[PDB]
């Protein structure tokens, strides 16, 4: 949740409130009761922002099958060089069920999103 003009980065500030999702990359950080890995331009991560990770669960995907950022014990998401950031005057309405409606939709405050009928 980044709150207007405020410092996304020591070089740029914010204009707008809403949040502001990151775009590429270029490290994260892992937590073990710690190492740390590194993207390159042809791989993406596949697991969430601050989700634990599990003993062999595939985390940071790319085009070669080989040399994969792989599970390992008990982790954390800590992404750290984002390409950029733009940010979106949206709200946030996490959800761990399933998605009902579809990207590409508007909706008005009341009607379900998600979840059955939480979200």
């Known amino acids: 949740e980044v709150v207007k003009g405020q410092e996304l980065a020591p070089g740029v500030v914010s204009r707008l409130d809403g ?3 990151y775009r590429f ?3 994260v950080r892992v937590e073990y009761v710690p190492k740390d890995y590194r993207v390159q331009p042809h791989m993406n991560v596949v697991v969430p922002e601050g989700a634990r990770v599990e003993a062999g669960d595939k985390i940071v995907a790319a085009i070669d099958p080989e ?3 792989i599970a390992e014990a008990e982790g954390v998401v800590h992404l750290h060089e984002p390409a950029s950031i733009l940010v979106v005057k949206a709200r946030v309405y ?3 069920d399933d998605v009902e409606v579809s990207t590409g939709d508007r909706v008005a405050p009341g009607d379900v999103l998600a979840d059955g009928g939480k979200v």
């Open 19 to 21: 949040v502001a999702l």
């Open 94 to 96: 996490p959800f761990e």
């Open 67 to 69: 040399e994969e950022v």
């Open 25 to 27: 990359p270029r490290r």
